[PDB]
Design a protein around this ligand. Structure first.
Ligand SMILES: O=P(O)(O)O[C@H]1O[C@H](CO)[C@@H](O[C@H]2O[C@H](CO)[C@@H](O)[C@H](O)[C@H]2O)[C@H](O)[C@H]1O
Ligand SMILES: O=P(O)(O)O[C@H]1O[C@H](CO)[C@@H](O[C@H]2O[C@H](CO)[C@@H](O)[C@H](O)[C@H]2O)[C@H](O)[C@H]1O
Lengths: 649, 649
């Protein structure tokens, strides 16, 4: 057998790990399958994509086109359907009809061998007609055969009878394919909408208490949910909800020792009250949780729980399973670190003594929360646990419950971030918060919307409890507004951590990315009613952004994204498309000064001519413009952070 | 099972066709194996390459290094040995000793936990010692263990006893490796020296005749061989040596019809006198050929025969095997084309009616010429025959005779050129002749010396009978000299076609790459003796270039090549290395005007520091310089086309 077939079809993409891991999509998402296709000699080739579903049923006829002249790289767009495991194949073939037309168009006018050329075409059309299942299509090809063979007519009109638009259309639907050759199938894992598209809100239930009871419960925190759903969020991400340890518990502003009332860090999981399968007694009981999950469901909110595979020193695992920790010659366990940061309140897990036991327990815990309506997990620091451990765990859970989504909080080097996505993590945290200039965003989003999108789905949190970027510290409210627009229009999944709306931006000290009086070490009651009444919240903007996203399919997908040039470093512009929905975004990245620029739109990139003008509506104002080729803009920080425009049809 | 192992080792290179075809090397050639290697957490990893020979025996210990900071891309150099099919594996592992030293160097001086740190190191060294096969090595590690555990000594000296150069050397030879994880093997095909390295000379035996008998014979052409070997060539490439057809035979300067005496084109193979397994009667007999082959052997010349799978209309195959040709409805066979060029004297072969028969016959012919001492074939237009056909043929021949080398004359699109190399062609013609400016050469050679070198070996013919570039047409002798230096120093295989030495450069017409009065259509007697005596040949330069190549291993390999910047567009500079042999080349690409430039050498790239100055000898003159950082040069076309300098050791 030969590695290469009769008509070469090579280097099919997308491909992940040489075909050992699947490329990804979600229900409804379009993407390009591509291949290198060519043949020996000068004759024409064709190709097409055969997409098969989990039952093996092929998709509709999906022909490909050479993507740039002279490159022999062919592609076409496919669209994923029901969830599950699909496969794709590329088929390549000789296209003898195209070759024959090309030659005949030259040979009949020049008077060369005309009878032979027409008879050769007649034999092709006859072969084409034989494989056409429809009788009206068959009869149309046979009539062109008869006109081609009619020696009483002039050569040009015998030929013209074979090139009519009604013949073209039969052959584009049922083409004559020689030497059909096929690639080996490649796997595609299709998952639910929410893995690619959603808006997320993180908050600490314990902060939503009452005057008489400061430490919130699941019942009091349920009262925050209607405001969250009113902002247009779909997912609620809760930090760890388990009992919190006492030994080496941390105090306010990350001080080493807790005083009597200090609540500690939710990430220091475990006490004699319970471990990862327990509720912190001050949040209530498992019943109170179910109530919270039910109320979230009634508002269109799914719950995502933090899953942090680590322990406080009071966690039951420390004495029940000491082999799950690395012990020093004197028997002590070194606390975790992420230098120069120290986590004195926790122990890291070790995996090389009882990997089976740790995997079995890990999936038990996850299945417990899944039994209580949790179908999404934000996994903390997955990169400090073995990559293969996550590969095994995710495959175990998705094997019985494929709807479960895992999100990797891996802020680390690129190889590890990518590898985690490839081995199963449905979503990934990104470098978004450290991409703030026009050049940084453009470069980074070109990476994420390009080849990486076949294995990684980005979740753009504009802030987190550990990341308050200098851009926000220095920019105030206008900076918060900018980053919300950026995050919500560039990624189909974005998120904020509560307080973002109030433009909380006091850092722990100059040069740091921690918040002052961080919610991780203390209760942080916020007076939401006052903020709303006094207009010192950007919740309305946030609400608007999620409404825009819900109304424009272009913003519920990742791969289609183009950047358009502007004549000012502080102003960025880009567009996104999906069917006939096109969205155009212009942002002023300067939060202090008013910026004017000329935005020059790559018009072919919107399906338009250079001369053309098109009506747009800025969905942040309801105000309408007519834009083309070159458009002036003026963006005043605080009044208008940006235009977010739909193209009107 | 998991796709990723305990310590991730991913995307091993080189790789060809995802591991379905082998990467290539030759006996003695070094190249880099690389991989992406990292682990979870902050501790160190190590890696190494296990190269296995055809009997499965591993090579020596071959550790890798991170190739650039923060990239997690690791590599090392391996060197191929005996011919055959080898495999390579990358092993990755935790490097607990490096982690432990790093920490201990900080912790012992700061006074932190000193007894624990030293005891943790002692347990490592003990584990390391247990896998050391040599008793003296074991005893050296065990003495460091005892010094580390000696609580009576100061901490700094207990530590220093574990960091001595004699301990370092035991651990660099036998390191303690945790969680050893291995890639799946990848295949490597190693072939003989001559597949990568050699100098080639093409000439038409029929042109070397006598006053009384103008059409040369194998016996008269043998007399040209000593001059060829004196020029330092290793391979003689003969155009087709078979009978030539009469029907549609071409005349002089590619005219349609031949007159009585016209010899026709050797590529119009076949007549009633015989086909591809026959000798043209005017060249003599199969005995005369053996004599030629024997005389070539005695001078260190191997023969390479053209193999052109096509026919004149008078070839026996036309009536013996009509199914090997595509016939038009009226029974005629269309002549070959390569538009806008027509080859009216030949028919192309068709492969889809009797592919078995054609393959069987093709290898019969090749085995016939192999029986007569021909172990190299220059395959004409492989790209007009199916890629898989060549895959099958080459695998059949190399299965019994792995020493046979095939060279693809495929001047076509990149995908097909690459694919042919990948499916078995030992050598490839290249775009060399159309790369003439500094930017063209730099880009193109960066491609060829980079990733493509794991599947393609370039043969740089500076001219061919079908390519007389405009650079030569317009540049005269200085241009010939330039290209000879370029070709011979940039590729370990280069070649010329006879006449190049005389600076034959009259084109058929302005705008063409054909020669006037082309040797393809007529006998071309040349006065070699006069040219030698009158100094109007560059054979001496050619002779010198092959001698330089035979004396400097740096020029007998491809992959190690670096370009150094110059301050003039017309002047190019580069270097090549192989062990202690470094060769440095500066070329003036202007054949009309004298050029001066400052060449600034990337000194770290020669294994030298910036301050250093280094003696060099220009091997085209025997003249000596001292060069560093910045060096002035003056190149006068005709007197000095270039410096070709060895670095003196
Ligand atoms: O920067 P990272 O190490 O990724 O931070 C992430 O993981 C840590 C550890 O769980 C979290 O750090 C918080 O929790 C620690 C343990 O309870 C505590 O010691 C730290 O001071 C506190 O920052 C972090 O929130 C998480 O996202
Ligand atoms: O352009 P290419 O086809 O790659 O050139 C190579 O193959 C052709 C076909 O054989 C050769 O062209 C010569 O031979 C033809 C057959 O006799 C003749 O008809 C043409 O006039 C002649 O140029 C070429 O030498 C070869 O290397």
């Amino acid at each position: 057998p030969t590695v290469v077939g009769r008509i070469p079809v090579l280097d099919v993409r997308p491909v992940v790990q040489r075909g050992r891991r699947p490329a990804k999509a979600v229900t409804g998402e379009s993407f390009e399958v591509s291949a290198t296709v060519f043949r020996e000699g000068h004759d024409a080739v064709g190709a097409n994509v055969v997409l098969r579903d989990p039952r093996g049923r092929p998709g509709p006829w999906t022909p490909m086109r050479e993507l740039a002249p002279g490159t022999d790289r062919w592609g076409a767009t496919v669209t994923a359907g029901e969830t599950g495991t699909w496969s794709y194949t590329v088929e390549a073939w000789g296209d003898p009809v195209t070759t024959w037309r090309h030659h005949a168009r030259i040979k009949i006018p020049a008077g060369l061998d005309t009878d032979l050329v027409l008879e050769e075409g007649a034999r092709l059309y006859e072969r084409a007609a034989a494989d056409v299942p429809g009788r009206e299509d068959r009869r149309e090809l046979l009539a062109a055969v008869d006109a081609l063979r009619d020696e009483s007519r002039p050569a040009a009109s015998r030929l013209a009878a074979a090139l009519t638009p009604q013949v073209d259309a039969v052959l584009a639907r049922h083409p004559l394919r020689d030497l059909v050759t096929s690639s080996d199938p490649l796997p595609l894992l299709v998952e639910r909408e929410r893995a690619l598209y959603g808006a997320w809100y993180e908050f600490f239930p314990r902060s939503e208490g009452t005057p008489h009871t400061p430490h919130g419960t699941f019942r009091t925190a349920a009262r925050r949910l209607p405001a969250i759903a009113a902002m247009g969020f779909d997912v609620v991400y809760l930090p760890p909800i388990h009992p919190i340890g006492t030994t080496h518990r941390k105090g306010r502003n990350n001080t080493l020792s807790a005083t009597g009332d200090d609540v500690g860090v939710p990430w220091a999981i475990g006490s004699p009250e319970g471990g990862h399968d327990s509720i912190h007694p001050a949040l209530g009981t498992l019943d109170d949780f179910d109530h919270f999950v039910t109320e979230a469901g009634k508002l269109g909110l799914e719950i995502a729980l933090d899953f942090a595979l680590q322990c406080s020193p009071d966690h039951p695992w420390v004495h029940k399973h000491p082999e799950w920790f690395h012990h020093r010659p004197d028997g002590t366990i070194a606390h975790a670190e992420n230098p120069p940061k120290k986590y004195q309140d926790i122990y890291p897990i070790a995996f090389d003594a009882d990997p089976d036991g740790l995997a079995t327990e890990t999936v038990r815990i996850l299945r417990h929360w899944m039994d209580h309506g949790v179908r999404i997990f934000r996994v903390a620091n997955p990169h400090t646990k073995p990559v293969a451990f996550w590969e095994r765990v995710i495959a175990d859970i998705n094997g019985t419950d494929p709807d479960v989504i895992f999100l990797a909080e891996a802020f680390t080097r690129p190889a590890m971030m990518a590898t985690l996505a490839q081995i199963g993590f449905q979503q990934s945290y990104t470098y978004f918060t450290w991409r703030n200039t026009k050049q940084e965003l453009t470069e980074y989003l070109t990476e994420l919307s390009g080849e990486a999108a076949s294995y990684m789905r980005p979740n753009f949190f504009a802030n987190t409890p550990d990341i308050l970027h200098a851009y926000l510290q220095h920019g105030g409210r206008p900076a918060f507004e900018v980053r919300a627009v950026l995050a919500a229009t560039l990624s189909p999944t974005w998120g904020i951590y509560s307080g973002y709306e109030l433009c909380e931006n006091t850092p722990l000290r100059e040069g740091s990315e921690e918040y002052l009086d961080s919610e991780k070490y203390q209760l942080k009651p916020r007076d939401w009613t006052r903020a709303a009444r006094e207009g010192t919240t950007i919740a309305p903007l946030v609400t608007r952004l999620n409404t825009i996203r819900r109304e424009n399919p272009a913003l519920r997908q990742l791969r289609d994204l183009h950047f358009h040039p502007t004549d000012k470093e502080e102003v960025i512009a880009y567009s996104k498309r999906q069917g006939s929905n096109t969205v155009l975004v212009v942002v002023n990245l300067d939060p202090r000064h008013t910026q004017e620029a000329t935005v020059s739109l790559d018009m072919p990139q919107l399906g338009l001519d250079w001369h053309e003008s098109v009506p747009v509506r800025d969905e942040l104002t309801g105000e309408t413009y007519h834009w083309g080729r070159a458009n002036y803009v003026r963006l005043e920080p605080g009044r208008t952070p940006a235009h977010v425009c739909t193209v009107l049809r």
